[PDB]
Amino acid sequence: ATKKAVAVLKGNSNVEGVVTLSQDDDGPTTVNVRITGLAPGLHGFHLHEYGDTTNGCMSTGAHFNPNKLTHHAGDLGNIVANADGVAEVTLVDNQIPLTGPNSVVGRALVVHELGRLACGVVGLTPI
Amino acid sequence: ATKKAVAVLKGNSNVEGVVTLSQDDDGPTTVNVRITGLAPGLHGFHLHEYGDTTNGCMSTGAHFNPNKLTHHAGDLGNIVANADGVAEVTLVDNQIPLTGPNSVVGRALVVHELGRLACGVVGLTPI
Numbered sequence: 001a002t003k004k005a006v007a008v009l010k011g012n013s014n015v016e017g018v019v020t021l022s023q024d025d026d027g028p029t030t031v032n033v034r035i036t037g038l039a040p041g042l043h044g045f046h047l048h049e050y051g052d053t054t055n056g057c058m059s060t061g062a063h064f065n066p067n068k069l070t071h072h073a074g075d076l077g078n079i080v081a082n083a084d085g086v087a088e089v090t091l092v093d094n095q096i097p098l099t100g101p102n103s104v105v106g107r108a109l110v111v112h113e114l115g116r117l118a119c120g121v122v123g124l125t126p127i
Numbered sequence: 128a129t130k131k132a133v134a135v136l137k138g139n140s141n142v143e144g145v146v147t148l149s150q151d152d153d154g155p156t157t158v159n160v161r162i163t164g165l166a167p168g169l170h171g172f173h174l175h176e177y178g179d180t181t182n183g184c185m186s187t188g189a190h191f192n193p194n195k196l197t198h199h200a201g202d203l204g205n206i207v208a209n210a211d212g213v214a215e216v217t218l219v220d221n222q223i224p225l226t227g228p229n230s231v232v233g234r235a236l237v238v239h240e241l242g243r244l245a246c247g248v249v250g251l252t253p254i
Protein backbone atom coordinates (compact mmCIF):
# COMPACT_ATOMS: atom_id res chain seq x y z
CA ALA A 1 0.00 0.00 0.00
CA THR A 2 1.87 2.89 1.49
CA LYS A 3 4.55 1.78 -1.04
CA LYS A 4 4.84 -0.34 -4.22
CA ALA A 5 7.62 -1.60 -6.52
CA VAL A 6 8.02 -3.99 -9.42
CA ALA A 7 10.74 -5.90 -11.27
CA VAL A 8 10.62 -7.24 -14.80
CA LEU A 9 12.77 -10.34 -15.08
CA LYS A 10 14.72 -11.35 -18.20
CA GLY A 11 17.96 -13.17 -18.90
CA ASN A 12 20.19 -15.20 -21.19
CA SER A 13 17.38 -17.69 -21.75
CA ASN A 14 13.66 -17.44 -22.51
CA VAL A 15 12.85 -16.98 -18.83
CA GLU A 16 10.85 -13.81 -18.22
CA GLY A 17 8.49 -12.55 -15.55
CA VAL A 18 7.17 -9.82 -13.31
CA VAL A 19 7.33 -9.50 -9.55
CA THR A 20 5.32 -6.88 -7.69
CA LEU A 21 6.09 -5.85 -4.10
CA SER A 22 3.90 -3.97 -1.66
CA GLN A 23 4.73 -2.77 1.86
CA ASP A 24 3.12 -0.46 4.44
CA ASP A 25 5.90 1.51 6.07
CA ASP A 26 8.22 -1.19 7.37
CA GLY A 27 5.60 -3.94 7.74
CA PRO A 28 5.44 -7.31 5.95
CA THR A 29 6.16 -7.15 2.22
CA THR A 30 3.68 -8.88 -0.07
CA VAL A 31 5.27 -10.32 -3.20
CA ASN A 32 3.42 -11.50 -6.32
CA VAL A 33 5.43 -13.57 -8.74
CA ARG A 34 4.78 -14.86 -12.21
CA ILE A 35 7.72 -16.18 -14.16
CA THR A 36 7.57 -18.23 -17.37
CA GLY A 37 9.96 -20.20 -19.57
CA LEU A 38 11.41 -22.06 -16.60
CA ALA A 39 12.27 -25.75 -16.53
CA PRO A 40 9.66 -27.53 -14.39
CA GLY A 41 10.87 -27.93 -10.82
CA LEU A 42 12.50 -26.01 -7.97
CA HIS A 43 14.36 -22.73 -8.49
CA GLY A 44 16.21 -20.30 -6.23
CA PHE A 45 14.77 -16.81 -5.73
CA HIS A 46 17.03 -14.15 -4.17
CA LEU A 47 17.60 -10.45 -3.65
CA HIS A 48 20.98 -9.30 -5.03
CA GLU A 49 22.94 -6.16 -4.20
CA TYR A 50 23.05 -4.18 -7.44
CA GLY A 51 20.39 -3.30 -9.99
CA ASP A 52 22.98 -3.68 -12.73
CA THR A 53 22.10 -5.84 -15.71
CA THR A 54 24.80 -4.40 -18.02
CA ASN A 55 26.57 -7.74 -18.00
CA GLY A 56 23.42 -9.80 -17.61
CA CYS A 57 22.51 -11.21 -14.23
CA MET A 58 26.16 -11.60 -13.17
CA SER A 59 26.38 -7.80 -12.79
CA THR A 60 23.72 -7.89 -10.07
CA GLY A 61 26.58 -8.84 -7.77
CA ALA A 62 26.32 -10.60 -4.40
CA HIS A 63 23.35 -12.08 -2.57
CA PHE A 64 21.94 -9.18 -0.56
CA ASN A 65 20.76 -9.50 3.02
CA PRO A 66 18.96 -6.25 3.97
CA ASN A 67 18.97 -7.18 7.65
CA LYS A 68 22.57 -8.26 7.91
CA LEU A 69 23.43 -6.13 10.96
CA THR A 70 20.14 -6.52 12.81
CA HIS A 71 20.08 -7.86 16.39
CA HIS A 72 18.22 -16.03 5.56
CA ALA A 73 17.05 -12.49 4.76
CA GLY A 74 17.30 -11.94 1.00
CA ASP A 75 16.52 -15.60 0.27
CA LEU A 76 12.87 -15.30 -0.70
CA GLY A 77 12.48 -19.07 -0.74
CA ASN A 78 12.53 -21.65 -3.52
CA ILE A 79 9.78 -21.43 -6.10
CA VAL A 80 8.25 -24.26 -8.12
CA ALA A 81 7.74 -24.06 -11.86
CA ASN A 82 4.85 -26.26 -13.04
CA ALA A 83 4.99 -28.64 -16.03
CA ASP A 84 4.23 -25.64 -18.25
CA GLY A 85 7.34 -23.88 -16.98
CA VAL A 86 5.33 -21.31 -15.08
CA ALA A 87 5.96 -20.22 -11.49
CA GLU A 88 3.03 -18.20 -10.18
CA VAL A 89 3.06 -17.55 -6.43
CA THR A 90 2.30 -14.99 -3.71
CA LEU A 91 4.68 -14.62 -0.74
CA VAL A 92 4.71 -12.48 2.41
CA ASP A 93 8.22 -11.75 3.62
CA ASN A 94 9.17 -9.76 6.68
CA GLN A 95 12.64 -8.93 5.41
CA ILE A 96 12.16 -7.03 2.16
CA PRO A 97 12.36 -3.31 2.90
CA LEU A 98 11.16 -0.80 0.33
CA THR A 99 12.36 2.04 2.59
CA GLY A 100 15.51 2.97 4.48
CA PRO A 101 19.25 2.69 3.76
CA ASN A 102 19.01 -0.99 2.84
CA SER A 103 15.93 -0.62 0.64
CA VAL A 104 15.82 -3.00 -2.30
CA VAL A 105 14.54 -0.28 -4.67
CA GLY A 106 17.27 -0.01 -7.30
CA ARG A 107 18.69 -3.45 -6.43
CA ALA A 108 17.91 -6.77 -8.14
CA LEU A 109 15.80 -9.94 -8.00
CA VAL A 110 17.36 -13.07 -9.48
CA VAL A 111 15.99 -16.53 -10.24
CA HIS A 112 18.59 -19.28 -9.75
CA GLU A 113 19.10 -22.74 -11.18
CA LEU A 114 19.29 -25.47 -8.58
CA GLY A 115 23.19 -20.39 -12.49
CA ARG A 116 21.50 -17.00 -12.84
CA LEU A 117 18.54 -17.64 -15.17
CA ALA A 118 16.76 -14.28 -15.07
CA CYS A 119 16.95 -10.97 -13.21
CA GLY A 120 15.47 -7.50 -13.02
CA VAL A 121 15.95 -4.19 -11.32
CA VAL A 122 13.49 -3.25 -8.60
CA GLY A 123 11.75 -0.05 -9.65
CA LEU A 124 9.09 2.24 -8.17
CA THR A 125 5.49 1.97 -9.35
CA PRO A 126 2.35 4.08 -8.57
CA ILE A 127 0.89 3.61 -5.06
CA ALA B 128 32.18 8.60 -7.27
CA THR B 129 30.61 8.71 -3.86
CA LYS B 130 27.66 7.12 -5.74
CA LYS B 131 26.96 5.28 -9.04
CA ALA B 132 23.92 3.98 -10.94
CA VAL B 133 23.13 2.52 -14.34
CA ALA B 134 20.15 1.90 -16.62
CA VAL B 135 19.87 -0.62 -19.41
CA LEU B 136 17.54 0.67 -22.10
CA LYS B 137 15.26 -1.53 -24.23
CA GLY B 138 11.87 -1.14 -25.87
CA ASN B 139 9.34 -2.12 -28.51
CA SER B 140 11.94 -1.62 -31.22
CA ASN B 141 15.59 -2.63 -31.68
CA VAL B 142 16.75 0.39 -29.68
CA GLU B 143 18.97 -0.63 -26.78
CA GLY B 144 21.63 1.02 -24.67
CA VAL B 145 23.30 1.69 -21.35
CA VAL B 146 23.50 4.89 -19.35
CA THR B 147 25.80 5.23 -16.37
CA LEU B 148 25.43 7.98 -13.76
CA SER B 149 27.93 9.17 -11.19
CA GLN B 150 27.48 11.79 -8.45
CA ASP B 151 29.45 12.93 -5.38
CA ASP B 152 26.95 13.63 -2.64
CA ASP B 153 24.60 16.15 -4.24
CA GLY B 154 27.09 17.59 -6.75
CA PRO B 155 26.90 17.54 -10.57
CA THR B 156 25.86 14.20 -12.05
CA THR B 157 28.01 12.81 -14.85
CA VAL B 158 26.08 10.79 -17.39
CA ASN B 159 27.57 8.45 -20.02
CA VAL B 160 25.24 7.37 -22.76
CA ARG B 161 25.49 4.84 -25.54
CA ILE B 162 22.32 3.88 -27.33
CA THR B 163 22.06 1.96 -30.61
CA GLY B 164 19.38 1.04 -33.14
CA LEU B 165 18.10 4.62 -33.31
CA ALA B 166 17.05 6.41 -36.48
CA PRO B 167 19.74 8.98 -37.32
CA GLY B 168 18.84 12.40 -35.96
CA LEU B 169 17.58 14.13 -32.81
CA HIS B 170 15.87 12.28 -29.97
CA GLY B 171 14.37 13.28 -26.62
CA PHE B 172 16.04 12.04 -23.43
CA HIS B 173 14.08 12.33 -20.17
CA LEU B 174 13.76 11.12 -16.59
CA HIS B 175 10.35 9.56 -15.89
CA GLU B 176 8.64 8.97 -12.55
CA TYR B 177 8.35 5.20 -12.25
CA GLY B 178 10.82 2.38 -12.86
CA ASP B 179 7.96 0.27 -14.21
CA THR B 180 8.46 -1.44 -17.55
CA THR B 181 5.64 -3.99 -17.08
CA ASN B 182 3.70 -2.35 -19.87
CA GLY B 183 6.75 -1.23 -21.80
CA CYS B 184 7.88 2.36 -21.61
CA MET B 185 4.33 3.68 -21.14
CA SER B 186 4.36 2.29 -17.58
CA THR B 187 7.24 4.60 -16.67
CA GLY B 188 4.56 7.24 -16.22
CA ALA B 189 5.02 11.01 -16.27
CA HIS B 190 8.06 13.15 -17.03
CA PHE B 191 9.81 13.53 -13.68
CA ASN B 192 11.28 16.78 -12.44
CA PRO B 193 13.34 16.04 -9.30
CA ASN B 194 13.61 19.74 -8.46
CA LYS B 195 9.99 20.66 -8.97
CA LEU B 196 9.53 22.43 -5.62
CA THR B 197 12.95 24.08 -5.43
CA HIS B 198 13.26 27.86 -5.00
CA HIS B 199 13.68 21.89 -17.32
CA ALA B 200 14.96 19.50 -14.65
CA GLY B 201 14.41 15.92 -15.84
CA ASP B 202 14.91 16.91 -19.49
CA LEU B 203 18.47 15.71 -19.99
CA GLY B 204 18.64 17.37 -23.39
CA ASN B 205 18.20 16.09 -26.93
CA ILE B 206 20.71 13.55 -28.15
CA VAL B 207 21.90 12.97 -31.72
CA ALA B 208 22.08 9.52 -33.27
CA ASN B 209 24.72 9.33 -36.02
CA ALA B 210 24.17 7.78 -39.47
CA ASP B 211 24.90 4.39 -37.88
CA GLY B 212 22.02 4.88 -35.47
CA VAL B 213 24.33 5.28 -32.51
CA ALA B 214 24.09 8.00 -29.86
CA GLU B 215 27.23 8.08 -27.74
CA VAL B 216 27.58 11.11 -25.47
CA THR B 217 28.72 12.31 -22.04
CA LEU B 218 26.64 14.91 -20.15
CA VAL B 219 27.02 16.72 -16.82
CA ASP B 220 23.68 17.65 -15.31
CA ASN B 221 23.13 19.51 -12.08
CA GLN B 222 19.61 18.19 -11.59
CA ILE B 223 19.89 14.42 -11.43
CA PRO B 224 19.97 13.37 -7.77
CA LEU B 225 21.07 9.88 -6.82
CA THR B 226 20.23 10.65 -3.16
CA GLY B 227 17.33 12.08 -1.20
CA PRO B 228 13.52 11.78 -1.43
CA ASN B 229 13.48 12.63 -5.14
CA SER B 230 16.36 10.34 -6.08
CA VAL B 231 16.07 8.81 -9.54
CA VAL B 232 17.28 5.40 -8.31
CA GLY B 233 14.34 3.09 -9.00
CA ARG B 234 12.81 5.52 -11.54
CA ALA B 235 13.26 5.47 -15.33
CA LEU B 236 15.19 6.93 -18.27
CA VAL B 237 13.33 7.14 -21.57
CA VAL B 238 14.44 7.98 -25.11
CA HIS B 239 11.74 9.81 -27.10
CA GLU B 240 10.91 10.16 -30.76
CA LEU B 241 10.81 13.73 -31.99
CA GLY B 242 6.85 8.14 -28.90
CA ARG B 243 8.69 6.19 -26.21
CA LEU B 244 11.39 4.25 -28.10
CA ALA B 245 13.35 2.71 -25.23
CA CYS B 246 13.51 2.84 -21.44
CA GLY B 247 15.20 1.35 -18.41
CA VAL B 248 15.05 1.36 -14.66
CA VAL B 249 17.80 3.21 -12.82
CA GLY B 250 19.62 0.72 -10.60
CA LEU B 251 22.52 0.84 -8.15
CA THR B 252 25.98 -0.29 -9.25
CA PRO B 253 29.29 -0.74 -7.30
CA ILE B 254 31.04 2.51 -6.27
Ligand SMILES: [K+]
Pocket residue numbers: 026027028029093094095096097
Ligand atom coordinates in the same frame (compact mmCIF):
# COMPACT_ATOMS: atom_id res chain seq x y z
K1 LIG C 1 9.37 -5.87 7.50
Ligand SMILES: [K+]
Pocket residue numbers: 153154155156220221222223224
Ligand atom coordinates in the same frame (compact mmCIF):
# COMPACT_ATOMS: atom_id res chain seq x y z
K1 LIG D 1 23.22 18.46 -8.23
